[PDB]
């Protein structure tokens, strides 16, 4: 899709992440872990919320009847009315069809977008201390324990703290 992450270079979703929309999985010496990212999940949710609010805002226009349910309508005027109403109906079913198709397109792509934006945020955090998988993972070239992992998700990772160790490992030297 538009941003290349969701249904893109990320091969699939995580059914086990019922905690949020986007998130992290890590692996170090202590083992594995999973945590949802709140900010990115919320940015997407609030946008969906916006569309639903627009969908559900109502117009104030009150209409009266121009067709009797119980007594006959004169034939010519009746034909005019049927023609007008069907023409109005076609317009509205066209518009409804378009609204959904267009909105769905935008919804799908903005969620891809928020996924990518999170990915980019982490990439720049780690700068020269990690390398990209190509599959949405970063290989970290230093000892990253559960607190270091947490500081990455929590946006407090200080790259300069590990840069020396990391660069030597990326160069494969001592």
């Amino acid at each position: 899709g538009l941003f290349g992450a969701i249904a893109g270079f990320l091969e699939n979703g995580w059914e086990g992440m019922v905690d949020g929309w986007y998130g992290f999985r890590h692996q170090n010496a202590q083992g594995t872990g999973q945590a949802a990212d709140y900010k990115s999940t919320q940015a997407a949710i609030d946008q969906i919320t916006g569309k639903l609010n627009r969908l559900v805002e109502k117009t104030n226009t009150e209409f009266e009847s121009i067709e009797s349910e119980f007594s006959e309508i004169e034939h010519q005027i009746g034909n005019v009315i049927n023609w007008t109403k069907d023409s109005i109906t076609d317009i509205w079913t066209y518009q409804a069809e378009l609204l959904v198709a267009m909105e769905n397109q935008h919804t799908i792509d903005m969620a891809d977008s928020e996924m990518l934006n999170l990915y980019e945020r982490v990439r720049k955090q780690l700068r020269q201390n990690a390398e990209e998988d190509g599959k949405g993972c970063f290989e970290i070239y230093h000892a990253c324990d559960d607190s270091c992992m947490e500081s990455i998700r929590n946006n407090t990772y200080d790259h300069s703290q590990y840069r020396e160790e990391a660069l030597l490992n990326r160069l494969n030297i001592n």
Binding site: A5, I6, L10, E11, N12, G13, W14, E15, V18, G20, W21, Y22, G23, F24, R25, H26, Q27, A29, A44, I48, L52, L55, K58, T61, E62, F63, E64, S65, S68, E69, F70, S71, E74, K85, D90, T93, A96, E97, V100, A101, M102, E103, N104, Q105, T107, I108, A111, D112, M115, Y119, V122, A130, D133, G136, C137, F138, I140, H142, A143, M149
Partner: protein, 318 residues
Amino acid sequence: DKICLGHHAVANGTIVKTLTNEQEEVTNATETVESTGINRLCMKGRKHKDLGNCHPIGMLIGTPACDLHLTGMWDTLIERENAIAYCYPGATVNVEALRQKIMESGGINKISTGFTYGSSINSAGTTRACMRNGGNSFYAELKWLVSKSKGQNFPQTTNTYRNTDTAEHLIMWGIHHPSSTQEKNDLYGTQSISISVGSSTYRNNFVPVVGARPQVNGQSGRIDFHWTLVQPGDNITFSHNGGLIAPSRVSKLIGRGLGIQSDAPIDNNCESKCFWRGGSINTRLPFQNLSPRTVGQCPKYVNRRSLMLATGMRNVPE
């Protein structure tokens, strides 16, 4: 050591349409077209009048079925199917324009014309087609004028209603078309019969016409009803010599109201702003597929069972 970025997925996704893809699967979706309506008339918060077997036209002329609906105030007026307009058979000119005017009013006042008639006139003409409390009666707002002496010439007479109010008045009257010459002669005499009606802005002439025809409600005679609006300060004059079904009261349509045509049971518990033949429609959704004929503030009608709006990202399981 590595940190992996990802997004969630669900087991059972939903199919939605996009510009480019007809069968796109997402994590969640919500309906945009209401398919469910309530088979009742949600009247909570609104002062409504159920007319039952009274037809809106009958409110103006005073058909027995409408005796409890000759006057009132309402913000919603409910007309039912097979409602009765005419006790004595007949038809109204421009009936549908009249019905619509009534069905968008917020009430009806009635005001007496003050018409009086001389001794040679029987103004209490009565018919078995219009029963009231076990007796032969007639339209409550009208009088069937007939010669007091059977067979004699109905006298030339003039009656003038003066609108002295500050709002326009809806006046209705009838023209009797006898089913036979004997009957016409019995009621109005052998003379040539003419009826003139003239206000400042309206004028028309009417001539009762004898003619053989089937019995409706046991009568082959007919009454044709006519109406006009009398402006404030204006007079309307009736000049006649037999065959005039005269107004004894005149109507005034008051304010605005919502008219509904439905035989759906009233429910005073629920509120609604949208109605159709089949009841009420309560939704926040912008579209519905229940009916193309609705009144009130309604979702637009669309020819689709379903239009799913995605509320989640692309579903990608594995």
